[PDB]
Amino acid sequence: SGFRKMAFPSGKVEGCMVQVTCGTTTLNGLWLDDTVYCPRHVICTAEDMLNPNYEDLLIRKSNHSFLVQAGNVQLRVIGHSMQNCLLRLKVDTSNPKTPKYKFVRIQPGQTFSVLACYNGSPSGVYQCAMRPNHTIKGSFLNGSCGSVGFNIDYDCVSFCYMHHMELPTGVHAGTDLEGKFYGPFVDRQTAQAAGTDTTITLNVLAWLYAAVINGDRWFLNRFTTTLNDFNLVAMKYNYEPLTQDHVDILGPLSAQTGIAVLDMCAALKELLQNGMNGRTILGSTILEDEFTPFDVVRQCSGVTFQ
Amino acid sequence: SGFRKMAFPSGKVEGCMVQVTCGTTTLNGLWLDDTVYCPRHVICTAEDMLNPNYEDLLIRKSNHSFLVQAGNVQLRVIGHSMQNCLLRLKVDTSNPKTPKYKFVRIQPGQTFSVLACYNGSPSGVYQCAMRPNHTIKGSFLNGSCGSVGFNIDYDCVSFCYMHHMELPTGVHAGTDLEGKFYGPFVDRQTAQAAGTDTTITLNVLAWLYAAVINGDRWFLNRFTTTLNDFNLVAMKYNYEPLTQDHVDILGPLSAQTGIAVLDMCAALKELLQNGMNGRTILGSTILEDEFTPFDVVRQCSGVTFQ
Ligand SMILES: *[C@@H](CC(=O)OCC)[C@H](C[C@@H]1CCNC1=O)NC(=O)[C@H](Cc1ccccc1)NC(=O)[C@H](CCC(=O)OC(C)(C)C)NC(=O)OCc1ccccc1
Numbered sequence: 001s002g003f004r005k006m007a008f009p010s011g012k013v014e015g016c017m018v019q020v021t022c023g024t025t026t027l028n029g030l031w032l033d034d035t036v037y038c039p040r041h042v043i044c045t046a047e048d049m050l051n052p053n054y055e056d057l058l059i060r061k062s063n064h065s066f067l068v069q070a071g072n073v074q075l076r077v078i079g080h081s082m083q084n085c086l087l088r089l090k091v092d093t094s095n096p097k098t099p100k101y102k103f104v105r106i107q108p109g110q111t112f113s114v115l116a117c118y119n120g121s122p123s124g125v126y127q128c129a130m131r132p133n134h135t136i137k138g139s140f141l142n143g144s145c146g147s148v149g150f151n152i153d154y155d156c157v158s159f160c161y162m163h164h165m166e167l168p169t170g171v172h173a174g175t176d177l178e179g180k181f182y183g184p185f186v187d188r189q190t191a192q193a194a195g196t197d198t199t200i201t202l203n204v205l206a207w208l209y210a211a212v213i214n215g216d217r218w219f220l221n222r223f224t225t226t227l228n229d230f231n232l233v234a235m236k237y238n239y240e241p242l243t244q245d246h247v248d249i250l251g252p253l254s255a256q257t258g259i260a261v262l263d264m265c266a267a268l269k270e271l272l273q274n275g276m277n278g279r280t281i282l283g284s285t286i287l288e289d290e291f292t293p294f295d296v297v298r299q300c301s302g303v304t305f306q
Numbered sequence: 307s308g309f310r311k312m313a314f315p316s317g318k319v320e321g322c323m324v325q326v327t328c329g330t331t332t333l334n335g336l337w338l339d340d341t342v343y344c345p346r347h348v349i350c351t352a353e354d355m356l357n358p359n360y361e362d363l364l365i366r367k368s369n370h371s372f373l374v375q376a377g378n379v380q381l382r383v384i385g386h387s388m389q390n391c392l393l394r395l396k397v398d399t400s401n402p403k404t405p406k407y408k409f410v411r412i413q414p415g416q417t418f419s420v421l422a423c424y425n426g427s428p429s430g431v432y433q434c435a436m437r438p439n440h441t442i443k444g445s446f447l448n449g450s451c452g453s454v455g456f457n458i459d460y461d462c463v464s465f466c467y468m469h470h471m472e473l474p475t476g477v478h479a480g481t482d483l484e485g486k487f488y489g490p491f492v493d494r495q496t497a498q499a500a501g502t503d504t505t506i507t508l509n510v511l512a513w514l515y516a517a518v519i520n521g522d523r524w525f526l527n528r529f530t531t532t533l534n535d536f537n538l539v540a541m542k543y544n545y546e547p548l549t550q551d552h553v554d555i556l557g558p559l560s561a562q563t564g565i566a567v568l569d570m571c572a573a574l575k576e577l578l579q580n581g582m583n584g585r586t587i588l589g590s591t592i593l594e595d596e597f598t599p600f601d602v603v604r605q606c607s608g609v610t611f612q
């Protein structure tokens with residue numbers, strides 16, 4: 001029993017972190033096979049940051065403009081190219097610790113583990129959701145750029161995020177491992193702001209299923225709702241519209257608990273309208289939206305505490 | 307910026323996890339050098355669980371009664387002994403992945419990272435506090451016994467917890483790596499219950515410092531309090547008494563923010579008495595008690611967002 005925000009074991013990713021220096025800028029890189037991936041903003045200096053032209057900044061560098069350190073060992077750069085907002089630095093050594101991996105672009109609402117890293121050395125791990133507005137609520141200081149986000153399926157690491165920047169609200173933006181940003185953001189110091197966010201409805205519902213599997217039913221009611229009547233209420237409370245796809249995704253959790261999705265929806269409608277009356281759900285006084293249905297299945301018992 | 311419950315990178319601990327079988331019971335073991343540590347309740351079968359005599363159960367086993375698997379490789383047991391509620395199985399191979407490590411007995415209120423493990427294979431990592439009543443609010447299923455808790459200082463792993471059992475409230479109990487339980491609990495299936503818990507006052511205060519360092523001051527007030535007047539209020543709200551030692555521990559955070567401890571105490575007194583008025587602190591609608599002062603210093607910038 002219990003329910004915690006649980007990150008993937010980070011060992012396979014720790015063995016891939018390096019430090020990348022260019023001029024007086026140091027940040028983190030990811031070393032797989034004989035390539036090191038890092039944010040391209042490593043090539044900026046102070047002033048470059050406002051209006052940098054990366055093609056023009058890069059063509060001015062050689063291979064030996066880049067210093068790469070793996071632990072206490074210098075990796076020699078024998079090649080470099082730019083791919084979107086990332087650099088791909090070819091090095092002379094293949095990483096002997098390279099796990100099976102994939103690059104994946106996660107979708108809004110999905111979760112992943114972040115390995116916060118400084119000067120190429122891992123310092124902590126925590127679980128994030130990709131918000132609807134394409135930012136994450138991370139925890140990052142200066143020097144954390146190039147820290148990556150990932151999931152693990154079997155023994156395969158699916159990398160999905162590389163950290164690039166912090167926005168004025170203290171939330172975070174970055175790219176997939178193709179260097180394509182999540183959201184409308186750009187790697188330069190303009191006046192960009194996170195758009196308005198929404199509560200992730202599918203996840204709140206998954207988490208209500210988790211509470212049931214774990215033995216708690218207090219928030220349920222005798223009612224049902226239609227997808228549409230639910231969505232009218234959803235909009236009023238800044239929740240994402242529920243779709244039939246979301247209803248189908250919730251199938252297996254519905255089956256394990258015996259609670260029809262739209263019945264769980266009515267329960268949710270009631271919680272939004274009435275509050276929790278000073279009670280908790282899985283120890284929480286608020287409606288948690290950062291566990292997916294897959295997160296609940298991965299953590300909860302396959303047997304309901306009936 | 308940001309503030310997350312952050313676990314230590316788990317790689318050094320993942321390389322030490324094995325599976326230990328005895329009869330039809332499988333659980334996790336920790337492999338350092340040529341010793342594997344596991345809960346001694348591995349030697350119980352069904353019925354043994356209520357009134358087991360471990361000395362009598364153990365003397366009936368040989369070395370080859372124990373099956374130990376490291377990944378896909380069988381480690382041969384050449385020795386075994388009991389130490390408190392743990393077994394120490396000597397094996398023929400020294401773990402080539404043994405990190406620098408210590409065994410430490412953590413104190414109530416202190417935190418640590420848990421590597422949840424099943425059948426010797428790590429499945430997730432999350433941060434816990436040791437509650438005042440010597441339990442943790444973990445997330446564990448059947449097969450999770452022998453999963454360990456740890457901190458990392460530099461590159462040294464300080465192991466502090468091994469998981470043994472779940473109590474009726476869904477919270478968890480276990481031992482240090484000497485096999486001595488945290489709390490009055492015993493490794494048999496009696497009618498034991500967690501004692502009443504308390505809120506960890508020192509940590510709540512550390513977390514209020516974290517909120518200030520991160521730029522937020524809304525909860526402060528013009529008042530001060532004495533240690534004693536504070537404690538009268540503390541008792542009324544099920545908070546631990548504040549001690550002078552706690553005040554001294556909070557020194558560096560006090561210094562970084564310019565807020566005297568007892569002034570932060572007055573602010574806390576006010577929050578307990580009045581509530582948060584529908585506002586959040588570091589994104590939380592409740593007073594968080596699972597970050598130590600060391601957790602705040604390890605995660606927050608050394609520069610206050612003034
Ligand atoms: C990692 C970079 C690194 O590790 O090595 C040194 C370059 C930084 C991590 C950030 C900083 C704190 N926490 C983090 O997550 N990333 C950056 O410093 C990037 C750098 C950069 C350089 C060139 C081109 C593009 C990006 N910059 C930012 O994150 C930047 C920080 C501004 C900020 O919000 O912090 C304070 C201290 C001023 C409050 N953010 C940014 O430009 O956002 C857009 C914006 C700027 C100004 C006004 C309004 C919006």
Ligand SMILES: *[C@@H](CC(=O)OCC)[C@H](C[C@@H]1CCNC1=O)NC(=O)[C@H](Cc1ccccc1)NC(=O)[C@H](CCC(=O)OC(C)(C)C)NC(=O)OCc1ccccc1
Pocket residue numbers: 001331332333334347350354355446447448449450451452470471472473474478492493494495496497498499
């Ligand atoms: C790990 C053991 C393992 O991995 O391999 C198989 C042995 C178990 C992890 C627990 C179970 C679910 N989550 C966890 O954290 N640990 C146990 O099963 C131990 C086993 C044991 C055997 C012999 C001697 C001592 C301990 N037992 C318990 O945790 C036990 C479980 C009872 C429980 O609360 O679960 C449900 C399903 C019945 C709700 N807890 C226990 O004995 O607590 C004291 C108590 C028992 C009965 C009534 C009141 C209090």
